[PDB]
Design a protein around this ligand. Structure first.
Ligand code: MIN
Lengths: 10, 26, 250
């Protein structure tokens, strides 16, 4: 159930 | 230099709810 | 953390979450000891029995967090790793002796109300505080039972006599380890549990008011079992390697 982190950090 | 001093606690002279339990055992 | 309670905001500003990118999941706890360096347990990154061997691109460091699953916009800061350093003598084959690893962040994190490094003990600090009966504090987002919490949990736990630690297990204890937890007849209980690996066991010095990281959540058998104790990496005993790595690498 983790919220999506900002794409940028991936 | 400033390690281990919490902005929301030691720097304002505020204690968290259980750190006295720690100090009482020392 | 089993039998702990919800942390207060800003109560452990050094707590770091090690987060896997794919699948997106909490791997381990960790601690911030400077703007560029994070400390965790080596078993969080390398443990061949279970085929674990994570490198830098596999992970993200999330600092300043309170909520386990939410992306705390404008509070937390996420970082990528530049390099991982595992103690060359970490003993994953036998008893997890020297369970410790340093992580070099790609760019300095800026400190704030929710992000601030813990101190590393010196000899005098370790000698005064790492005594049987003295309590330290473990924090983490790990399991509440042997579900998972919505926010960081915290528990205060007494250091235990090395004889009693040795007599509770068949695994070989070394001087690079100490154990902590309440005795089966003390009434109080609490322990770290899965997902708390790599997190900080800290103590507040009564001489200068600072928090020092005395241990790293390393191993145990179960969570909060009676007559069993949590075992921690003794951070001062491995400090010469820490200092050697940070001044040999940045
Ligand atoms: C579950 N037990 C094993 C016991 C062990 C200890 C040393 C060497 C081999 C096996 C363990 O702790 N570990 C196996 C390898 C990794 C480590 C672990 O799971 N540590 C996490 C701890 C979190 C807190 C919990 N109370 C105990 C386990």
């Amino acid at each position: 159930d983790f919220e999506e982190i900002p794409e940028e950090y991936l | 230099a400033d390690c281990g001093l919490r902005p929301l606690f030691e720097k304002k002279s505020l204690e968290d709810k259980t750190e006295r339990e720690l100090l009482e055992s020392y | 953390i089993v039998e702990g309670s919800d942390a207060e905001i800003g109560m452990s500003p050094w707590q770091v979450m090690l987060f896997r990118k794919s699948p997106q999941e909490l791997l381990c706890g960790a601690s911030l000891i400077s703007d560029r360096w994070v400390l965790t347990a080596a078993h969080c990154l390398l443990y061949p029995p279970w085929d674990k061997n994570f490198t830098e691109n596999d992970l993200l460091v999330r600092i300043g967090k309170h909520s386990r699953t939410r992306y705390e916009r404008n509070i937390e800061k996420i970082s990528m790793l530049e390099k991982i350093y595992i103690h060359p003598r970490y003993n994953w084959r036998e008893n997890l002796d020297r369970d410790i690893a340093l992580m070099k962040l790609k760019k300095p994190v800026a400190f704030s109300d929710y992000i601030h490094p813990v101190c590393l003990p010196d000899r005098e600090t370790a000698a005064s505080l790492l005594q049987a009966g003295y309590k330290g504090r473990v924090t983490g987002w790990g399991n509440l039972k042997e579900g998972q919490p919505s926010v960081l949990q915290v528990v205060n736990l007494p250091i235990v006599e090395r004889p009693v630690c040795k007599d509770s297990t068949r695994i070989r204890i070394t001087d690079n380890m100490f154990c902590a937890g309440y005795k089966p007849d003390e009434g109080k209980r609490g322990d770290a549990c899965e997902g708390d690996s790599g997190g900080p066991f800290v103590m507040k010095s009564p001489f200068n008011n600072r928090w020092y990281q005395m241990g790293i959540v390393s191993w145990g058998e179960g969570c909060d079992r009676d007559g069993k104790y949590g075992f921690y990496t003794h951070v001062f005993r491995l400090k010469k390697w820490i200092q050697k790595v940070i001044d040999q690498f940045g």
